[PDB]
Symmetry: D2
Subunit: 121 residues, 4 copies
């Protein structure tokens, strides 16, 4: 899917390189400008490969576990959102960042936020 | 013992997953509710070297709700942690985004929480 | 029977509330966890004329975590529904925002879920 | 609290009129540009009345139950966020909109989003 496939940046300055496969797969790498992260992390996700054509966005999501060969934050983020195509393509998301915690600290395990991605073009 | 296996949440949904050695999650999801029938592909990631202090194992995965039977034009992500032991559990929060027009984007995303165990419902 | 009363969540926190006839919630909250001691003021709102089809009663409330003992420079909102019957329940999701610099705003907000009943813990 | 007290608008065109009391109270009215809503609804909430002075925002939250003398959507929204003062004051929030549902439909009871409010000045 040519629309989604490419390089994207968000408002924090983070980098999202993704390829959208014909089967609904998302694969790529993520580099965060913030947090307990350095270098590229694997991402995987899914997207609606046959979206509505009535002006609606294309639903998608992906996950990064924050372990690579250089860093392990013991955490994972999922982004859930929609791709909005056109000449000024955007991916608008909300996300959940869960850190591994003890059971007593589980109440404070999950951060929530929102990222807007702009396609480099 | 481990993430790999067949899990069920409080709604009776079935989450079948394999955890690869280096952090991949791959499997299928069947929801007991919503605009869904049969199994859907899921992929995700988990921390393949968790802390050794009693902490849970962070993980997440995604389902896009399109298969041979239906297309809900939506996707859910689950973010959470696996907690091992005698009754292993995955505790999650989730975000279900539907494709919308820009005008309706404000009402595009449902949020909830699912807890999974390996105990089959009756 | 009703929203008015003393409630306890799964953490052992104590939520004491009065539901006014026209939709006000007023009371106190004591958290079993976090940067908190003793009771904090809370205020909120509820649907004072719910649907008559078996649906729950929508409600929400806020605590700012400042009292005579501490100030965590944070606030939590709970959004959910009251479900009456033999074991009345309030099921919520919550957002805990801490005051941060603009640079740290990305990590300002925790999310979770609390379920309340009138059963005192032991 | 002069900072928070005033009229605010968000990116949807909704209107938030609030008064911040010395005791940490927020009181006012909300008018939504969208959804099952018409006219003004009561809001109540709380804010940190003695915030940090190290450059941090002021934590706050409020609730609207979507019943007034003209409309009842059988729902309630809470906004949780922070006030960022200065000449271009903002209230940056995330929100949870819970609708009353049957028990079988409770899984789909709650919407999540984010609103940014600008002070009318
Ligand atoms: O601190 C960690 O646990 C790992 C890094 C998390 C970075 C977060 C931050 N970076 C970003 O591009 N968007 C937000 C949501 S991602 O969880
Ligand atoms: O209706 C749809 O858009 C597709 C099905 C969504 C089912 C949801 C529901 N099922 C489940 O096991 N947990 C929750 C979160 S999943 O988004
Ligand atoms: O640490 C703080 O900032 C203040 C205390 C927060 C306690 C939280 C925790 N306690 C509870 O009963 N439910 C959850 C959500 S409330 O934000
Ligand atoms: O549809 C309803 O149930 C009542 C109206 C909800 C309006 C929502 C929408 N309007 C707004 O200014 N911000 C968002 C979050 S508020 O729940």
């Amino acid at each position: 899917e040519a629309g989604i496939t490419g390089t994207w940046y968000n408002q924090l300055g983070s980098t999202f390189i993704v390829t959208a496969g014909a089967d609904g797969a998302l694969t790529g790498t993520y580099e965060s400008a913030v947090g307990n992260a350095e270098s590229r992390f694997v991402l995987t996700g899914r997207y609606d490969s046959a979206p509505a054509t009535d002006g609606s966005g294309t639903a998608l999501g992906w996950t990064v576990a924050w372990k690579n060969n250089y860093r392990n934050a013991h955490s994972a983020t999922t982004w859930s959102g929609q791709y909005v195509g056109g000449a000024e393509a955007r991916i608008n998301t909300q996300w959940l960042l869960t850190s591994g915690t003890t059971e007593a600290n589980a109440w404070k395990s999950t951060l929530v936020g929102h990222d807007t991605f702009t396609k480099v073009k």
